[model samples]
Target chain A: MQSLQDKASVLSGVDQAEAFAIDESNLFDKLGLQTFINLSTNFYTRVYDDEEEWFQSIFSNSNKEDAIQNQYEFFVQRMGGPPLYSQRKGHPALIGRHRPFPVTHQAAERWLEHMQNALDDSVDIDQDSKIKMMKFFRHTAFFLVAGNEL
Target chain B: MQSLQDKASVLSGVDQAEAFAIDESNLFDKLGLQTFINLSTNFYTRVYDDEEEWFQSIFSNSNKEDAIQNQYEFFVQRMGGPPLYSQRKGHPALIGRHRPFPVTHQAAERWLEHMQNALDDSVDIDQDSKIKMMKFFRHTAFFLVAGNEL
Candidate 1:
């Protein structure tokens, strides 16, 4: 927020060149969830338990440990890290593949409840980050309301 | 409008079988007259043409004919016919370019008055469209207001 307030547009323009170049540290995406990897990782952890349980539940009959690791790699890629997930799968159909799972309103509700529960466990984040996290999850869960999926 | 009602998506999904199909009438860039363009055009014509001298004086410049033609082409392009305007110069920076013109509160009021006058002349268009046009224009003009660009 401090960074946004300090755009070249801050001062009245004497000359185009005279206006100070906007700093790299100040540059940010419109939606300022600064640490995306941390955010996605938190969401993933909240959505599922340990690697073994996650694979058993989601990718039934698949190798449990590999399945969980693949998902982690997928999440990392999605959060603007290296192309880890797609390197193996060729394409990550995060939504389309999940169509097989009956992600009903009940499932969405359970997901949100678990996420909030996980947030209760985390004591490290600042108030602003917590508020943002809550907002993000709420918005996401609202979209996840696949009432007719079953 | 019928297709829009049927789909109700922000972008119509591509057919799975179709590699690259084009609707003959689908000029993608030629979207319908956005709120600002409709309002501004109508306002310019009405205010500048309510009296003969005002119209004649405004059109006295050597480049007036070209400017008038460009605006007409712009209107047609925006009204979802074909790519006429952007094919020449570039994307219509309606807000940014107009920012250089000190658009004061009084200027906006004058614009509104002129727009109303033009609409009063056009009784053939249905009552609903007329109402929608006016409401959209008002909202659009407000959006165009950049902070004192001086």
Candidate 2:
């Protein structure tokens, strides 16, 4: 029988620093930190302006501005900018953070609707960056679901 | 209302070549093609040896070597080495391909166990590479799960 140590050894030596350094390229800078901040700001604005009943119900307990700030910080951190997000809030367990809300396929699609619009409206990067960002948001939006399909 | 053009702008300019070139950092070569092949080969051998009833039930109708070959090609393609997988089998619609199987959390974990064991026993890469490879395998393995948690 293979020992558990041996089993785990397949993934040994991956340090946090090395993992962080994997994409040392300034992908975040290329995408523009301000662009992400703008995208989040724009997304929240539309979310409120459109007043989607379902989204409103979820954010009723949370401050909309704070949520937008959190999202901005997260994108900044994830894009390899500053550690402002983790420093203030710790790991961005996005799925866990979103668990209380009722997430479904339609809800995720709706979120993407805003995200897509925001990416188009705010970010001035090439289309490739937008597509990449959109794809990440789409996958993550769905991954946050803790419920079955609605 | 934001113009429809603005809404759709985020997705523009994503050419196939650019999209494909996104991860051109030689992650495949770093992991080593032979290592992936060995991982697949060792994993299947253990799958049969351990006699996982659920996995066995799914693959019982399929040819083992062919299944192994398909995985090898898919890994090869994913690692940025060759287009052999797409050329031979079209898009690696992993979710669609796996929909026929009754995948649950337990099944995914079982599969990962074999993979972990295989990586420990067969492959010899640095810890950083091993960690990266393991993370990819873990995520892809779970994503292949078609059903909710058991």
Candidate 3:
């Protein structure tokens, strides 16, 4: 495991335009396939190892390797690569995909925690790319949370 | 399958004093085991056949037989009988038990619909007892939904 270090959230005070700027970049092309793989692997490893049963149990039903692959495949395609994820799993309906889980506000907070940790620990990701990616993730994470209301 | 018939909801304008008044009665003693069995069986049968996939998919992971038994056992104990559910599965943590599923308000509403149908069709339950049980179900269903907020 890589040593943990703190990073300031690039999300704060960032305009809506800046937050979604990740969409304009070909992140997969710039970061390469290995970077996405590294990011997803790092994220899920932290996820599965989360000691809180409430947080860890959310992903308990998912196969770790499969989750990593699916995550990176989606990342690869969304950040401008071939349709590796969609060709296999169809459209990535993020909310519907997560409908079965208890995706509460606290649960999403725990997830975003591990995700930030993963991105920070990943090698070969530019600081700017990490900021862009993290913003998209924060925006999208809350997007999923919006419809997850009980 | 029992044919559907119109049954006015006992829940309509029900008094708060009467809603929880089931606690005072020994419904299990009055109704007997087969009555609970018939009710759960009828309820689950309807649930499995639900035309809406969102409603059906919440229970898709459970074995039909297992779901039925757990339900009736809880009903049997709560309505005033031996602790069939707790002895076998430990404390009857209603919210905890349903935490893994997507227990939304609409999901609970659909479930209550099927439960009402089952209760109305059951042969042995008196009209009075049906009112008691329906109110409990409605109250308990919303309790689970409270913590389920995303």
Candidate 4:
């Protein structure tokens, strides 16, 4: 378990001492739910296969296919799509939901790297869309870090 | 309304460029739901005195009584109590939900101050608990700022 100071330090880096940049673009209108699913699939594929032992260890308790579904569902709901995620999961209390995992600063950075690669490889998503999605993703990953005391 | 830059500046000041400190304490278990009710009620008393005014009329559309109920329910649900907010409003998509408010840096700061005073006045909360809730409040205040679209 990392200390609050460490978490804050990593978070500051995540936002660069700025307010969180949760872009208000309704990407669901432009990209649709399928695109989000593809992105999550691509991202989780990398996450489960991560060569870094410590990094991959963090997600060892999780099922990869389930991980993909959760991420895409949340993406769909958050990006202004139908409330698929909320309909299934009720609400995305992401910080508490992720408490079981060791969502440390290093973990967030590694997860973000995989997500960036997934975004880059996702030919279906436009570059502009990728930027918007990644900004929210980066901020959200750290948001979890604030409360993931384990 | 404050610019995103200004919001970021205020937020960074709030966090001191560190990560948000949402001390993962089982606050509901210790304080009970009634304590949270008291907290929101006290906070809104300050809010509604000037709530009807026109300039940056935050929470103008909602009734004060409803506001108190909504926040207390939210506090209970998130702090290891029942899922009151979820059953009532479904998932807590606060950013999208808060789209109606201007939620500028100034507005967030004003809101934080009010919350601070409420925390200060609430006799039921201990110093330790006060510390945790304040951290969550300050962090979430900035979290909502990004979705304001200002």
Candidate 5:
């Protein structure tokens, strides 16, 4: 959030080079592990709250706390600031990891909706950063779909 | 297909400006109405062939010809050529039209895969045009997700 305020201050006329060269710390600090953990928790909170049978079927089998921890580490590693996920879990072959689950387009959309609502409710980042984060989440979530919904 | 050959002939060393300034005809002709129509037909052919219960549930209730024609017109209008779809169907409120269907991530992926296969099998276009077409299809397809699988 503080990092977002910083970017907001220099929002105008930040050149392509400057944008590329922006400190990794500043970028990730805006999104931070805490935010991702919040995001995952809030997202699953919505998921478990739903009565949709397919959604319940998909997530009910999983251990939510462990899944949330994995999500946090994955986001951290993906943002270029951490070896924690890799150190603990090896390569983040995300799609490969998700292959065991049946993720329909509906499932993915539901997942994104939950995440989007969670971000909207809890994230304090600037709008641009929020948009970028949502894009990342959307792209990441879509490809996790590996099977037909039975 | 012929336009794709023409585009391929001019592909080498075509400057970025030339690429951008290329006539709308050549661009559309490379990926014109015929390709989309063929894509919709072949995609539906595959869909009809598949006996998967969920796939059938999503498509089986519809009149296949009407659906295919709708897709054909939608792509034609989207590609900056004809306005047949808008003239006939009003605005291309694709998601709204799709809202009654259950389009999960899996269904979206399957739709894209069929379209991808259809293009590969039927399109005689150059690699770049094919790539661009596939990207357009992908972006367009993901958004059709309306309801959850449950």
Candidate 6:
């Protein structure tokens, strides 16, 4: 059986120092909800192919490449991993920056599909980890939807 | 009452780009969480109190500094912000970076306190928004400690 340690080794060049910082401390273990940022990042990347066209089209004047890069940072910040972002970038406004786009239920659903697929891909985590992560991401993303329709 | 547009304006400058991208379509309606970063940075600075001491304690070793820097980036990325972090630094392994901190409940609690204090200082957000922000910070910090305990 793959141990958590073995499972951890699956991550890219993130040395043990980087890998260990992962919040295996699943929130769900305590409150039935784990908060894993990479799961979402991986999900986003996989669903979107880490491309721009999908995300950029939603925004009126925003560039696709710019959206991908920024979203990457935003996801990192969510996971408690690094400070490289707030250092060079100024600040994170959850709402203000997104106002330009019209996030609809369809968009959120699409995002959830990507995230769900990513979670499904993780073979290391047991059933509980997968289920909990699914719940948290779903609940949070559900709240993120802005408009009534796409 | 001021609109979300007015409140979000708190996050002016290059950082604003971070928010627009993540939405793909504008969804969430909250102000900037960048204030939390400033708060924690200031708190860490005050506690350590010296450039060299702070440097030695956090950045004294390449690993430790890298870890903290990574955490900062992770925090900003979640706030609908930027990816300047990975663009400049490398991919962040959040769980790996914080393992060495030997994070304790007490230490974690203290960290949350400082962050809470920081949230209280935001002029752009209203009382309800402030509470939500604090809740997110507290819950997230707890998630960090869960991964790094003992």
Which is the better candidate, 1 or 2, if ranked by TM-score?
2
Model 5 C-alpha lDDT per residue in residues A15-128, reported as the tens digit of each score: 222232222234466666777778778877888888888786787767878878878776665554454553454334343345457766677778878887888887456677
Task: Quantify all predictions' global Cα lDDT against the true fold.
Answer: 0.41, 0.58, 0.70, 0.67, 0.57, 0.44
Q: In candidate 4, what are the lDDT values of residues B1-150, reduced to their tens digit?
A: 233323543563545222222324467889998899999999998888755364226677789999899899988866667657644543354654565578776787788888999999998999877876776677567766644543
For model 2, the stretches where C-alpha displacement exceeds 4 angstroms are A1-29, A58-113, A126-150, B1-29, B58-109, B126-150
lDDT of 1 by residue, B44-86 (tens): 5565565645333534442534554566565454434444553
Mark the regions of model 1 whose C-alpha exceeds 4 Å error after superposition.
A1-150, B1-45, B49-67, B147-150
Q: List model 3 lDDT by residue over A1-150, tens digit each.
A: 010000112223333444456656578889899999989999999999999998888888789999999999988866766657644543354654566788776886788899999988887998999888877676556544543542
* Candidate 2 structure quality by residue, lDDT tens digits, A7-119: 11222222222223313355577876777778888998877776778776766777778888899898776655665564454335354345457877677778889888887
Per-residue lDDT of B11 in model 5: 27
lDDT of 1 at B104: 48
Candidate 4 CAPRI grade: incorrect
Write one digit per residue (lDDT tens) for candidate 5, span B18-84. 2322222344567667777787898888887777778767887788898899888866755555556
| Full-model lDDT, candidate 5 | 0.57
Model 6 TM-score (2 dp): 0.36
**DockQ-better candidate, 1 vs 6:** 6
Better of 2 and 3 by DockQ: 2
Q: In angstroms, how far off is B50's CA in candidate 6?
A: 11
Residue B50 CA displacement from its true place in model 5, Å: 41
TM-score of chain A of each: 0.46, 0.77, 0.87, 0.83, 0.74, 0.50
Candidate 6 residue runs with Cα over 4 Å from true position: A1-150, B1-37, B50-72
- For B3-86, candidate 6 gives per-residue lDDT tens digits of 222222332211223332333321123554455355445555543543444333643444534444555565554444554354
Each candidate's fnat, listed in order, reads: 0.00, 0.00, 0.00, 0.04, 0.00, 0.02
Q: Pick the candidate with the highest TM-score.
A: 4
* Tens-digit lDDT string for candidate 1 (A10-114): 221112122211111121232233243344456556555535453327535445455546655654443234445533442343333343565554565566676
- Mark the 10 consecutive residues where model 5 chain A has the least summed lDDT: A1-10
- CAPRI quality level assigned to candidate 3 from its DockQ score: incorrect
lDDT per residue (tens digit) for residues B24-121 in model 3: 66899999999999999999999999999989988888999999999999888667666566445433445444657887768878999999999989
Q: Regarding DockQ, does 3 or 6 come out ahead?
A: 6
